[PDB]
From a paper:
RsfS is a stationary phase protein that binds to the ribosomal protein uL14 on the large subunit (50S), and subsequently prevents its association with the small subunit (30S), thus tuning down translation during stress. Unlike HPF, the mechanism of stress response mediated by RsfS is conserved in bacteria (but it is also found in the mitochondria and chloroplasts); nonetheless, the knowledge of its mechanism of action and interaction with the ribosome is very limited. In this work, we uncover the binding mode and describe the detailed interactions that the stress protein RsfS establishes with the 50S ribosomal subunit in S. aureus using cryo-electron microscopy and X-ray crystallography. Experiments on 50S–RsfS complex formation under different magnesium concentrations proved that RsfS does not promote subunits dissociation, but rather functions as an anti-association factor.
To interpret the binding of S. aureus RsfS to 50S ribosomal subunit in more details, we solved the crystal structure of RsfS bound to its interacting partner uL14 at 2.3 Å resolution. Expression and purification of individual proteins were prone to aggregation; thus, we co-expressed, purified, and crystallized S. aureus uL14–RsfS as an entire complex. The crystal structure demonstrates that the binding is mediated by a series of interactions, both electrostatic and hydrophobic. Importantly, the primary contacts between amino acids such as Arg97, Arg107, Lys113 of uL14, and Glu70, Asp81, Tyr98 of RsfS are conserved across bacteria. In our crystal structure, Thr96 and Lys113 of uL14 indeed interact with RsfS; however, they form only a few H-bonds, thus unlikely representing the most crucial interacting interface. Furthermore, in agreement with the genetic data produced in E. coli, we show that in S. aureus Ser116 interacts with RsfS via its backbone; therefore, replacement of Ser116 side chain should not have a direct effect on complex formation and stability. However, in our experiments, we co-expressed uL14 and RsfS, and we did not observe RsfS homodimer neither in solution, as seen from the gel filtration profile, nor in the crystal structure. Overall, the uL14–RsfS interaction pattern seen in the crystal structure agrees well with the one identified in the cryo-EM structure. We speculate that such differences at the solvent facing side of RsfS are probably due to the fact that this region is, to some extent, flexible in solution, but stabilized in crystals.
Author numbering:
A (entry chain C): -1 to 122
B (entry chain A): 1 to 112
């Protein structure tokens, strides 16, 4: 029920080959150590699917797309998800994979992750 | 203007730079984020960058703010968010990988 920080494990919500990562660093000019929706992180792949492009042990960047310690909108709405989840991303922010699994938070569009939004089945 | 005529404008800009296999999807039933998805491609990384700029320019020229361009530099998949309408420009060798059309195979598709 708790936030995303170094050494926290996360499910991967795309077809990249990564199934579960281990956060090693929250990126962001604030230097702060909490990651939430729309934040980019560095992580090491700890579980991968055979035949995927992304393999166990790789170091990748990923954008947080679901957090089980959610964030509050300008609306005063507060959204939460049942699990922590991210999407492995390229350096320009396009997804490594080609498919997204489950719901992603709409903040990604303002984050310039609108590619991930356009592939995602559900936007909350 | 409404998304329909914004749609019409974007495809004209795409047809201007000889955008291939250009289709629109009606996303109204299916999404809150936009009304139309446009999908087209070019044969080389310059042409994909040109079709993108053409979509920006013809949308500026009528005073629509291009809200963001994503992947413009790499020129493989350039997403141009016009908010009401979202235009995907693909490198010929990348389009089939993503297969936007088949991901939304129940959205009303129109081709040009």
């Amino acid at each position: 029920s708790h936030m995303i920080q170094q050494e926290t494990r996360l499910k991967v919500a795309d077809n990249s080959g990564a199934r579960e990562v281990l956060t090693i660093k929250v990126l962001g000019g604030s230097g702060r150590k909490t990651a939430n929706i729309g934040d980019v992180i560095v992580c090491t792949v700890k579980n991968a699917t055979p035949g995927g492009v992304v393999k166990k042990g790789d170091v990748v960047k990923a954008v947080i797309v679901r957090t089980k310690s959610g964030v509050r909108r300008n609306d005063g709405s507060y959204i939460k998800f049942d699990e922590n989840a991210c999407v492995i991303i390229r350096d320009d922010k396009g997804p490594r994979g080609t498919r997204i699994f489950g719901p992603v938070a709409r903040e990604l569009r303002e984050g310039n992750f609108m590619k991930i939004v356009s592939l995602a089945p559900e936007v909350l | 203007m409404n998304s329909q005529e914004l749609l019409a404008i974007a495809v004209d800009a795409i047809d201007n730079k000889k955008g291939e296999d250009t289709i629109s999807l009606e996303m109204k039933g299916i999404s809150d984020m936009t009304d139309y998805f446009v999908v087209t491609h070019g044969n080389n990384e310059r042409q994909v960058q040109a079709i993108a700029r053409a979509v920006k320019e013809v949308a500026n020229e009528q005073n629509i703010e291009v809200k963001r361009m994503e992947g413009y530099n790499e020129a493989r998949w350039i997403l141009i968010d016009l908010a009401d309408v979202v235009v995907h420009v693909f490198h010929k060798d990348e389009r089939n990988y993503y297969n936007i059309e088949k991901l939304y195979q129940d959205a009303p598709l129109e081709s040009y």
